Amino acid sequence: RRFERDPTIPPDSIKVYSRTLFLGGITRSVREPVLRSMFERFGSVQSLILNHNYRHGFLKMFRRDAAEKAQVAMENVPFADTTIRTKWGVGFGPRECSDFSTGISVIPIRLLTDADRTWLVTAEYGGTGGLPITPGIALDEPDIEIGLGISS
């Protein structure tokens, strides 16, 4: 797990490495079983949700380094009637803080909601690994959209 001291980011901030990829060019010829097989070459797929209504999907890898390998390999892949285009997505924190070129957010701690703070510290994958949020640390995207809890 990434819990790095990053004392050269701005004051009162954290740095979050996305594990979430945006998938563009998802026509109805591009199906979840085939994409899962393509991305499982790079590591374990935590989540993969296509929405053919928007010609897009979102993939979350268990590991940042597998998301990096996937994004570079799958950046532009001709496929059937389309081209699959893999770009950095954001699954955590303010979208406005997410560098869409690199999948790296630098977030002022004051902009983290209570849910965001609780997900960071309690996530199974990414986050702090059970330590408090302090400024000048770099970590991986936490798991989100779960109950606020420390018992379960």
Author numbering: 388 to 539
How does the study describe this entry?
The long-wavelength beamline I23 at Diamond Light Source overcomes these limitations and extends the accessible wavelength range to λ = 5.9 Å. In this study, we report the determination of diverse protein structures by experimental phasing techniques carried out at long wavelengths on beamline I23 at Diamond Light Source using S, Ca, K, Cl, V, I, Cd, and P as anomalous scatterers. Native-SAD uses light atoms naturally occurring in proteins or bound to proteins.
To confirm the benefit of collecting at long wavelengths, we collected from Seb1-RRM crystals on beamline I23. A single dataset of 360° from a crystal diffracting to 1.8 Å was sufficient not only to solve the substructure but also to solve the structure without any phase extension, despite the low symmetry space group (C2), low overall completeness (65%) and the 27-fold lower multiplicity of only 6. This case clearly shows that data collection at longer wavelengths requires substantially reduced overall multiplicity. Solving a structure from a single crystal with low multiplicity is advantageous for multiple reasons: the number of crystals might be limited; crystals may not be isomorphous and cannot be merged or they may be especially susceptible to radiation damage.
